[PDB]
Amino acid sequence: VNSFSGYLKLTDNVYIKNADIVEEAKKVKPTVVVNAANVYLKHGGGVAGALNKATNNAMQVESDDYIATNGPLKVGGSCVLSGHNLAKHCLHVVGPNVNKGEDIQLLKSAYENFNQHEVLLAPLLSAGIFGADPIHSLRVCVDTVRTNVYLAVFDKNLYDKLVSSFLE
Ligand SMILES: Cc1ccc2c(C(=O)O)c[nH]c2c1
Numbered sequence: 001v002n003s004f005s006g007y008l009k010l011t012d013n014v015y016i017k018n019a020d021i022v023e024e025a026k027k028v029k030p031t032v033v034v035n036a037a038n039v040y041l042k043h044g045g046g047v048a049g050a051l052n053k054a055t056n057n058a059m060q061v062e063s064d065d066y067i068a069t070n071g072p073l074k075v076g077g078s079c080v081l082s083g084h085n086l087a088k089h090c091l092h093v094v095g096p097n098v099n100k101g102e103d104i105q106l107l108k109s110a111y112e113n114f115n116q117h118e119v120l121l122a123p124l125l126s127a128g129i130f131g132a133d134p135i136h137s138l139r140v141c142v143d144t145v146r147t148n149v150y151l152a153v154f155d156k157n158l159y160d161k162l163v164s165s166f167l168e
Contacts, residue, residue, distance in 0.1 A: 001029040002119050004150045010166050013148050014141060018159040021047055021152040022054045024121055025086035030150075033083055034114070034122035035059075036130070037092035039072035041079075047123045055084040063092070075102050076109030091117060095126035095137075104132060111144040119148045134158055135165045142166075 005027070007015035017024070025033045036047040041063035043052035052059040062081050073079060078093040095110040096102035110125045124141065126132035134153075141149065153159040 002031060003028050004030075004121075007150050008163060010138075010163075011142050013146060014151065015149070016138075016151045016153060016159070016162060016166075018154075018156055019152045020050075020154055021121065021123055022050050022086070024150075024152045025051070025054070025083075028121060028150075030083075030087045030119065030121040032089045032091050032117045032120045033087040034120050034125075035090050035092045036123050036125060036128075037073065037078075037094050038097075039075065039077075039094055041067055041073070041092055046128050051086060051090065054086055058082075058084045059090065076106040076112075078110075078113035087121065089117075091120065093125060095130055095132070097130045098126065099129070099131040104136075107132060107137060107140045108144050111141050114141075114145045114149055115147055117147055119150070121150050121152065123152060135162060138162055138166065 007017045043060055073094050075094050075096050081090050083090045093110050093113050096106040107126050124134050124137040126137055127134040
């Protein structure tokens with residue numbers, strides 16, 4: 001049903017909210033929730049861990065089965081799997097891990113995957129353990145994505161910095 005509420009317009013197609021993406025997916029019933037995935041689809045922490053836990057491990061069983069056919073994803077790549085109870089689809093997207101020397105230029109390729117979907121509920125890619133600057137990631141999102149993306153940012157302090165950087 002894509003019932004997004006309380007999102008701040010940043011640009012004509014990019015919205016942002018200070019919110020837990022798992023609680024957002026349960027209220028919104030989005031067509032697509034984006035996962036911040038790794039190449040092996042092992043959902044052991046962060047957004048990936050949170051989404052998988054909310055599916056009581058359904059997501060992780062489908063993920064393996066996909067890996068069995070494909071082997072690992074490529075950095076900047078993605079796959080469309082079931083959203084289970086959270087969404088119609090989950091778009092598993094791998095951004096570069098700059099801690100491991102993966103190139104920040106691949107963050108554009110990662111966001112390009114969003115353009116295959118009319119409307120997404122998403123985190124910022126390559127943030128957290130992936131080591132990119134979240135404000136940089138928001139700029140790449142705004143520059144690259146032309147479809148409608150509703151970004152959920154868990155941390156109030158980071159949310160306020162993002163909105164300060166974008167609108168002041
Ligand atoms: C959890 C869930 C399941 C299905 C859908 C859907 C659809 O089937 O069109 C749109 N949002 C959804 C959300």
